Amino acid sequence: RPTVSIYNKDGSVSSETLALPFVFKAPIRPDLVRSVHTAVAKNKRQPY
Amino acid sequence: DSVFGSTTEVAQLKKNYFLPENIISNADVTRLINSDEIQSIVKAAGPSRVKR
Amino acid sequence: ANPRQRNKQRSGKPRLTRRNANKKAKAKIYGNFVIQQNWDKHATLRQNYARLGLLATPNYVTGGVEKLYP
Amino acid sequence: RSKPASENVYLKLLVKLYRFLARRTDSRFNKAILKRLFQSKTNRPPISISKIAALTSRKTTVVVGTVTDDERMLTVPKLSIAALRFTKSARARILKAGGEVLTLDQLALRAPTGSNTVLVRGKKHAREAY
Amino acid sequence: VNIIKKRTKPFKRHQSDRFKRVGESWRKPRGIDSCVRRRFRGTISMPKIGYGNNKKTRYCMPNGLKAFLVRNVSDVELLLMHNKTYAAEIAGNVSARKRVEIVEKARALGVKVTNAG
Amino acid sequence: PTHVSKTRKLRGHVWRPTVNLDRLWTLLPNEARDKYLGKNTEVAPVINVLQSGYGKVLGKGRLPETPVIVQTRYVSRRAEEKIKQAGGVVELIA
Amino acid sequence: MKFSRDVTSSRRKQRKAHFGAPSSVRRVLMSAPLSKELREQYKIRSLPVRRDDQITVIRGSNKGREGKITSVYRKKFLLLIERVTREKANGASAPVGIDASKVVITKLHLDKDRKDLIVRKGGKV
Amino acid sequence: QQDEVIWQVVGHEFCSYRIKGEAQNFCRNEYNVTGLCNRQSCPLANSRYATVREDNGKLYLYMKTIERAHFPSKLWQRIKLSKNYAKALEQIDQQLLYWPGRQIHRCKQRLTRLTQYLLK
RNA sequence: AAAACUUUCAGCAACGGAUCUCUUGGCUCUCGCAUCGAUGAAGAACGCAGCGAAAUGCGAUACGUAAUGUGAAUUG
RNA sequence: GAAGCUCAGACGAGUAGGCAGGCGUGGAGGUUUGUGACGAAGCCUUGGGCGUGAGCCUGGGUCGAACAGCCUCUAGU
RNA sequence: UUUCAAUGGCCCGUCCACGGACCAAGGAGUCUAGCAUCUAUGCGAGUGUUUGGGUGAUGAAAACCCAUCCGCGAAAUGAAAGUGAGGUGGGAACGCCCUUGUGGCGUGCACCAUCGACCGUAAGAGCAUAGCUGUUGGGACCCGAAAGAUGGUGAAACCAUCUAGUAGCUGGUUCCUGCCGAAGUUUCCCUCAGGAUAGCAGAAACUCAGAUCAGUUUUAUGAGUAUGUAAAAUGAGAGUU
RNA sequence: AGCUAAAUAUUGGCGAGAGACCGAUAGCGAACAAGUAGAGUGAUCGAAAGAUGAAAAGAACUUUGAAAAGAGAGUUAAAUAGUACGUGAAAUUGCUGAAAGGGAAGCAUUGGAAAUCAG
């Protein structure tokens, strides 16, 4: 599993590293994300 | 790791949740077409845009 | 719209503006002095009770619990 | 149908890979697979793990669609399946108890012409009221 | 390849001339005895797909360049590749200060400006 | 979606729940299946079919041959002998 | 961001409140900044205008002019400063009003009522 | 994940570099070589590429690799050319000989009109 | 084939008040609260400012009085 | 732009109905380092250009403060 | 652009008749509940968090998390007690040959059949959501009819409500281009209006590369120049649920 | 025979905070002196009407006119902002210029004449 560098406040790469979480290998579905977000972006409307 | 989990191990912060497994294993079709295992069996290619 | 609310729309008398709304109206604690010192004016009551070691309810919680760490 | 009805970008990759194979080999397996990728969800019914186990003991098994699990049957044989999707229970049962699971992109790497592969299908009845 | 336009005159809605309430814009008639819909003699001509122009010479000005609408100078930088086939057209609301910046930039890049004036 | 409608393209034109023996072994936890099924142990499992949502057991399916105790409010006549050759007994709830 | 439910960020209600402000509230909307030498030795940033205060007009066609305020014309949010005027057609001189935010204060009208306020608003005198 | 799944997201319809016109579309990205929404052109879509641009009477070529494609700070490697026009044509094409040479035409074409812009 | 008259085209002017931009108003939702009157209420009529007819406020103490607060106005 | 490119052949009326692809309208999310007092929107014109078309872009005039292309969401379109 | 000449061109919508003096703005298949089909997405013998509880400091009516239940499905059948579950043929794909192939040979998913059994079961396929379309009910595409009811005000009439009352009917119903394209009639059922099955028009899923069809004619007739029937010419890819 | 919190309802009252709402034929009947002008014996009914400009700086003065007003001026960034006041469409009308017209016009195709534009 790959690692990713951790950045200090100044910008220097710290010695520590974390392994990339499995979620970053999840499928990328621009068709699904729009279908969900179309309805979820509707759930704060006020009636008129 | 616990907010989302893994495709084979349940997430800790979401119950009975495993990540969605990909429909396709490898996401490189253009490499799949241009790989040996297919290029060895594929019959001879036709021509490109064909003369009138 | 009602004549009554048209009265103070066409009147010159200033309203009775009453300034009341508070987002997160988390009521502060009186009663016991010990708990009132060691209350968290931000965290919720069921967090605060479990922080102190006090059972918020003896009966089962009719929903979910809070799990922040595995 | 010239293209699938799904906006699944990953499906269009399978079709693109298997549109190349359909016209560039004589494999009637490829033409059958490409056509079945076009068919709707109602026409790609699920097959069960048990049914696959029966059909192999009655070679990589190929089913376009889903492979669900059969809880009634307990000890799963060794199998090599290649399907569009797998239910989580079915995938664990095939993988832990014996063989391995594949996918239609991997299966093309394995058998581009479909040699030594059985192309199964699931009972296309749905409800079928009468 | 040159340009040939299969028809120059526009299409005018029937009786558009007679009435000011009837617009000068084409609406297809729906009457079942409409001489215009039944394409009689000396009647107005209905648009058909047969009138469509040549694909290789479509959306082309009589000087063989397709008009690309330009709002700022960063749009003219896009026509860098296609100076030989696209003509830069200034948007109608671009101020005088920006307009000269675009025209001077287009002149440097060799991109024709349809409305340089 | 009032943009994709047909009026848009028309502008201008005029109590005994049932369980069966095949499913019977699934009601027990997956862990204890791996230590009671296929192993010859003196202790037999208890499958309290009542405490899963069924009152009756039916005779569908075949039986793994491990003697098993099944707790039911009701049992089919051809369900109970099928577990008999399986070595187990039906235990009836009062 | 106004994190409070106490205050309204409606545009409609903010304009009604500005244009329905009573004189005892218009008196605050008519504040003016303090000039640099006033600002540093009183440690205060602004002040509501008062008659007889000496101001210099910062912005407008009367830029750089000075003068004394004659009357803080509160109904129309205007300040009438002496010896700044516009000439009417017939020959009369009708002063025009400058806004209290477009003028800076270079000399105050100190009174015991103002002195308490200056030390009230974190100042020194 | 890889070049084709990224293509069907950044490339096909929605990007921050696309300009759809009367009947077609352009590609505003600076690192493009044709200005069009094409796979052989779009870097967001594809792996290693090469294209040239103009700065203050000077030309510069940008290059990228695959091992470094995940680290965007130093992902692009720039080379500055301030010697001559015909030299620039040779300085560019020489560095892309080990590279697929289908887009050498587009690269060489770009230098010419960049040079022509400097003259005009 | 002249002028007028009629018609069309263009320019200007008229008429008219569309379009656009605005907007201390509407409508809809949510939130908080419970407080009219025989100690004369709701409503009605008359009346009052230096100059007010409307509207507001107010009651022969009449565009108010006392008290507290602010701290120099009101404005035609 | 694999939704692409290329070669070839045939066919073209059309009511009821069936079928796909587009043009314009008010608002919403995203985007364009987007347009604008050096003149936004509108409006006008014997000015020009584009599309078979719905429509679009533009010159000049008038005008004075906001508007739009693209991907999508929504309708008192 | 305007005018001129040559040829042409009945006024539009509606059902002769009815509507139309002219212009600008407004103006009609909408929202919603249930059901049905289809496509997509998520999961899969399961599925659905949003009645609630938890949580959310930054737009806290959003997002995020979850306990017990419950809905539908996982088993039917009888009115009810009660009870309660294959091999043959083809056939998609693969292997295999002889040496191509053909053909043979295996393998046989779906499904179709025959031929078998078990009480419908036979190795479960659904559940939710969004979209499209159809239909039923709500004012229900827009406008429009004669009455009535309540409670009032005058001296039966009048007034505000019920009330957007009632429509089998009248009139109107707003953008473009493209593709395909009818029947205009048998059939029956049918007190009543209709309902039909079929035909014509389509959309999806599956067989043979056919001698399968044909608004055609032949061949052979049989009987009375015609008539029907079965069995070569010609064209076409014909089919089916 | 009797009482009783909370959870629950809330187009009215006293206030607030919003909105994928409407934008002056819309939205409440009423954005404005609106339940107002007004109508009816009465019960009831019931409208239309928003925008000068940054600031009135609302046009001094002369002249013609009895007056209304006009013409000069003057204010302004602008009077193509003059209170009949942002923008100022169409119908409709007046003048000017061009053109055609013998009991129709309008339109269509093709070209000439004049006008005008481009490349």
DSSP codes joined into one string, D65-123: EEEE--SS--S----EEEEEEE-HHHHHHHHHSSSEEE-HHHHHHH-TT-TTEEE----
The 3-state DSSP class for residue C67 equals coil
DSSP H103-116: THHHHHHHHHHHHH
Residue G77: left (phi > 0), alpha (psi -120 to 50), or beta?
left
> Residues near A19 by Cβ (< 8 Å), separated by ≥ 6?
A1, A2, A3, A4
Minimum CA–CA partner of B6 in chain A: A22
User: Domain tally for chain D?
Assistant: 1
**From the Cβ of G6, is strand L under 7 Å away?**
yes
d(CA E77, CA E108): 11
* Residue from E106, E60, E100 nearest E80 by CA: E106
Q: Confirm or reject contact between B6 and chain A (CB < 8 A).
A: yes
**From the Cβ of E18, is strand L under 7 Å away?**
yes
Q: Confirm or reject contact between H46 and chain B (CB < 8 A).
A: no
The 3-state DSSP class for residue H18 equals strand
Strands G31-33 and F74-75: unpaired
DSSP B11-47: -SSSTT--PPPPSSS---HHHHHTSHHHHTTSPPP--
Cα–Cα distances in angstroms (integers) from residue B12 to residues A26, B4, C65, in the given order: 17, 8, 14
d(CA E43, CA G30): 74
* Residue from F59, F14, F18, F66 nearest F45 by CA: F66
Strands F46-48 and F69-72: parallel
d(CA E58, CA E85): 12
List chains adjacent to chain F, taking adjacency as at least 3 C-beta pairs closer than 8 Å. Answer: D, E
d(CA G119, CA G90): 49
Minimum CA–CA partner of F22 in chain D: D72
Q: CB B42 to CB D25 under 8 A?
A: yes
**Chain J bases closer than 7 A to any CB of the protein:** 1-3, 5-8, 12, 15-16, 20-25, 28-41, 49-55, 57-60, 69-75, 77
Instruction: Record the tokens describing residue F27, joined without a space.
Output: 């009601």
What is the Cα E50 distance to its own chain's centre? 18
Query: At D14, which helix (H) or strand (E)?
Result: helix D9-24
H77 forms beta bridges with H63
Q: CB H113 to CB E75 under 8 A?
A: no
Q: Confirm or reject contact between H116 and chain E (CB < 8 A).
A: yes
> Residues near G94 by Cβ (< 8 Å), separated by ≥ 6?
G85, G86, G88
Backbone phi and psi for residue E67, each to the nearest 5 degrees, phi listed first? -80, 120
DSSP F23: H
d(CA D27, CA D114): 7
CA angle B17, B20, B24 (to 5 degrees): 160
Q: Which class for F79: exposed (0-12), middle (13-18), buried (19 or more C-beta within 10 A)? A: buried
D62 forms beta bridges with D82, D119
Q: CB B4 to CB A27 under 8 A?
A: no
Instruction: Record the tokens describing residue D35, joined without a space.
Output: 């056509």
Residue D114: left (phi > 0), alpha (psi -120 to 50), or beta?
left
* Cα dihedral value F69, F73, F76, F81, nearest 10: 20
Its domain, for residue G55, covers: 1-125
* Cα dihedral value F63, F65, F67, F70, nearest 10: -10
Instruction: Record the tokens describing residue H68, joined without a space.
Output: 């470094």
Q: Determine the residue type at D91.
A: R
* Residue from F74, F78, F28 nearest F55 by CA: F74
Residue F33: left (phi > 0), alpha (psi -120 to 50), or beta?
alpha
> Residues near H45 by Cβ (< 8 Å), separated by ≥ 6?
H3, H6, H7, H10, H11, H39
Minimum CA–CA partner of E27 in chain F: F12
Radius of gyration of chain F (CA): 24
* Cα dihedral value D35, D36, D42, D48, nearest 10: 170
D72 chain-F contacts, CB cut-off 8 A: 22-23, 26, 61
Backbone phi and psi for residue G17, each to the nearest 5 degrees, phi listed first? -70, -40
Cα–Cα distances in angstroms (integers) from residue E53 to residues E58, E60, E63, E104, in the given order: 6, 10, 16, 34
Instruction: Record the tokens describing residue G90, joined without a space.
Output: 């017939």
* Residue from E6, F51, C30, B38 nearest D106 by CA: B38
The 3-state DSSP class for residue F56 equals strand
* Residue from C42, C17, C15 nearest C28 by CA: C42
Asked if residue D88 lies in contact with residue D108, where contact means CB atoms within 8 angstroms, the answer is no
Chain E 46-65, CB < 7 Å to strand K: 46-50
d(CA D71, CA F20): 12
The 3-state DSSP class for residue F19 equals strand
d(CA F19, CA F25): 11
Q: Confirm or reject contact between F11 and chain E (CB < 8 A).
A: no
| Residue found under tokens 């089962």 | C60
User: Domain tally for chain G?
Assistant: 1
Chain G 65-104, CB < 7 Å to strand I: 71-76
DSSP C18: -
> Residues near H8 by Cβ (< 8 Å), separated by ≥ 6?
A30, D9, D12
Cross-chain CB nearest to E110 (options H21, H26, H116): H116
d(CA A24, CA D58): 42
Cα distance from D71 to chain F (closest Cα, Å)?
Answer: 7
The 3-state DSSP class for residue C7 equals helix
Cα distance from E26 to chain H (closest Cα, Å)?
Answer: 21
Report the first-to-last Cα separation within chain B, whole angstroms: 60
Asked if residue D63 lies in contact with residue D81, where contact means CB atoms within 8 angstroms, the answer is yes
Asked if residue G79 lies in contact with residue G49, where contact means CB atoms within 8 angstroms, the answer is yes
The 3-state DSSP class for residue F67 equals coil
Asked if residue H54 lies in contact with residue H72, where contact means CB atoms within 8 angstroms, the answer is no
Its domain, for residue E89, covers: 1-117
Length of chain C: 70
For the packed helices H104-119 and H85-95, what is the interaxial angle rounded to 10 degrees? 160
Q: Confirm or reject contact between D26 and chain A (CB < 8 A).
A: no
Strands H59-64 and H50-54: antiparallel
Instruction: Record the tokens describing residue F1, joined without a space.
Output: 């979606």
Strands D60-68 and D117-119: parallel
Asked if residue F32 lies in contact with residue F54, where contact means CB atoms within 8 angstroms, the answer is no
D13 chain-H contacts, CB cut-off 8 A: 4-5
Length of chain E: 117
- Provide the b/e sequence for B18-47 (b: ≥16 CB within 10 Å): bbebbbbebbbbbebbeeeebeebeeeeee
Instruction: Record the tokens describing residue D60, joined without a space.
Output: 């990589």
Residue F77: half-sphere exposure toward Cβ, Cα within 13 Å? 0
Resolution to 1 decimal, in Å? Answer: 3.4
Query: At F57, which helix (H) or strand (E)?
Result: strand F56-58
d(CA H32, CA H11): 12
Mutation site, C18, C23, C26, interface G, largest G CB count within 10 A: C23
Asked if residue G27 lies in contact with residue G79, where contact means CB atoms within 8 angstroms, the answer is no
DSSP chain G: ----SSS---HHHHHHHHTT--HHHHHHHSEEEBPHHHHHHHT--EEE--TT-EEEE-SSTTTT-EEEEEEEETTTTEEEETT--EE-SSS-EEPPPB-TTSEEEEE----HHHHHHHHHTT---
Experimentally, the structure was elucidated by: cryo-EM
| Residue found under tokens 């008062």 | G50
Asked if residue G44 lies in contact with residue G123, where contact means CB atoms within 8 angstroms, the answer is yes
Its domain, for residue D122, covers: 1-130
Asked if residue D81 lies in contact with residue D101, where contact means CB atoms within 8 angstroms, the answer is yes
d(CA E107, CA C7): 69
Nucleotide closest in space to G5 (CA vs C1'): L17
Cα–Cα distances in angstroms (integers) from residue F79 to residues B9, E22, F57, F71, G99, in the given order: 38, 84, 7, 13, 97
Q: Confirm or reject contact between A10 and chain D (CB < 8 A).
A: no
d(CA D114, CA D29): 6
Assign 3-state DSSP to chain E and report helix, strand, coil percentages, each to 5: 25, 10, 65
Q: Determine the residue type at F91.
A: E
The 3-state DSSP class for residue H97 equals coil
Domain range annotation of chain H? 3-119
Asked if residue H107 lies in contact with residue H92, where contact means CB atoms within 8 angstroms, the answer is yes
* Residue from F70, F69, F67, F59 nearest F21 by CA: F59
Asked if residue D107 lies in contact with residue B26, where contact means CB atoms within 8 angstroms, the answer is no
The 3-state DSSP class for residue C2 equals coil
Instruction: Record the tokens describing residue E40, joined without a space.
Output: 């009689």
> Residues near A6 by Cβ (< 8 Å), separated by ≥ 6?
A13, A14, A16, A17, A18
Pick H3-119's CATH classification: 3.30.70.520, 3.50.50.60, 1.10.287.10, 3.30.390.110: 3.30.390.110
> Residues near B41 by Cβ (< 8 Å), separated by ≥ 6?
D25, D112, D113
Residue F7: half-sphere exposure toward Cβ, Cα within 13 Å? 3
Asked if residue D68 lies in contact with residue D44, where contact means CB atoms within 8 angstroms, the answer is no
d(CA F13, CA C2): 46
